[PDB]
Design a protein around this ligand. Structure first.
Ligand SMILES: CC(C)(C)c1cn(Cc2ccc(C(=O)NNC(=O)C(F)F)s2)nn1
Ligand SMILES: [K+]
Ligand SMILES: [K+]
Ligand SMILES: [Zn+2]
Length: 357
């Protein structure tokens, strides 16, 4: 059983020319990679080559206009970059941003291909910029193209259109883009855990609430787990997996699992305010590995404490490699509002998932 790993240092070239200390740093990915080396995890993986996504592949999820505008940034002058970036919610652009986004996506496609052709069992993709906020027609939240959504459609394109893909988004932020892209789709089950705060937390939309269950044939295939009023950590996430994520996933029977693996819910993150531990992320990963005959791709999203994300993601890879799960700390009583969140979701989804009744 082989675990693949993809990483290319050229994804570091995407940078913030006005604010060089912006938390979506180049070194997010070099740090994670270094920690894999340090722990001797790298040498235990098969290295999967990065490549650029093609414009045709982008069109799996994104409009020509969007692709064209971001493509054009490659040749923009500083003023054009700053103004274009400022047309979006929370975006910075440099001349290398487009190519970096292509590299992130194409890295994940190669990884999905390696999994689906049986060359590896599972894989980790250490990529930036992130993807899950990226919409069909717009950039958002440090994301240009929706890497994970693209990877799902890429997987369908090399297997069959109806290949069942579960996307579990444990980044602390709602994947607005991923929700929307698959909102009318029953082939792609989207499950997101996220800090919501009654819509006050980025990206600040009630779309992230538990009552958005999907539209049309996608009804029941969008699962939002919003957290409110609580510094959520390993007990709340373990409870959500037990009561919601795993029961729904098992019943869906995915053929491929993608993890929108942000590590901004991690203890010490400067933005998330949460306290999931490296060991917590290992248990989450271990649980997902029981799905899809173990066909799991972990895709880096957000996460801004360089130490926290390095420890947390390297622990995930350790789980993929088949190492036994570390012990969790003492699971404090589940926080109250978390029970309330889990109950709301149970009631929203019991109509669609018999395992919930
Ligand atoms: C530069 C500072 C720190 C002032 C700042 C805060 N925010 C708010 C946000 C916009 C987007 C965010 C986010 O989504 N983070 N994690 C992701 O999943 C992303 F990587 F995809 S937090 N903007 N700028
Ligand atoms: K999420
Ligand atoms: K869906
Ligand atoms: Zn995030």
């Amino acid at each position: 059983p082989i675990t693949g790993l993809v990483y290319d240092q050229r994804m570091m070239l995407h940078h913030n020319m006005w604010d060089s200390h912006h938390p979506e740093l180049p070194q997010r990915i070099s740090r994670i990679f270094s920690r894999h080396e340090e722990l001797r995890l790298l040498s235990r993986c098969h290295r999967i080559p990065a490549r650029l996504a093609t414009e045709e592949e982008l069109a799996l999820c994104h409009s020509s206009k969007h692709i064209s505008i971001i493509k054009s940034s490659e040749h923009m002058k500083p003023r054009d970059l700053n103004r274009l970036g400022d047309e979006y919610n929370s975006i910075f652009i440099s001349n290398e941003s487009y190519t970096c986004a292509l590299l992130a996506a194409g890295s994940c496609f190669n990884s999905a291909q390696a999994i689906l052709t049986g060359q590896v069992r599972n894989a980790v993709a250490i990529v930036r910029p992130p993807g899950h906020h990226a919409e069909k027609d717009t950039a958002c939240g440090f994301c240009f193209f929706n890497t994970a959504a693209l990877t799902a459609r890429y997987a369908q394109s090399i297997t069959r259109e109806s290949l069942r893909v579960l996307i579990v988004d444990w980044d602390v932020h709602h994947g607005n883009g991923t929700q929307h892209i698959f909102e009318e789709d029953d082939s792609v089950l989207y499950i997101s855990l996220h800090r919501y705060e009654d819509g006050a937390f980025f990206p600040n939309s009630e779309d992230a609430n538990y009552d958005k269950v999907g539209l049309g044939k996608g009804r029941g295939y969008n699962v939002n787990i919003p957290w409110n009023g609580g510094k959520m950590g390993d007990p709340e996430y373990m409870a959500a997996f037990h009561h919601l994520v795993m029961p729904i996933a098992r019943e869906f029977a995915p053929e491929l699992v993608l993890v929108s693996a942000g590590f901004d819910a991690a203890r010490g993150d400067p933005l998330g305010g949460f306290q999931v531990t490296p060991e917590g992320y290992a248990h989450l990963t271990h649980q997902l590995m029981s799905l899809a005959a173990g066909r799991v791709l972990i895709i880096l999203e957000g996460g801004y404490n360089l130490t926290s994300i390095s420890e947390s993601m390297s622990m995930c890879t350790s789980m993929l490699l088949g190492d036994s799960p570390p012990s969790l700390d003492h699971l404090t009583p589940l926080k109250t509002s978390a029970t309330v969140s889990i109950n709301n979701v149970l009631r929203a989804h019991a109509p669609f998932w018999s395992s919930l009744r």
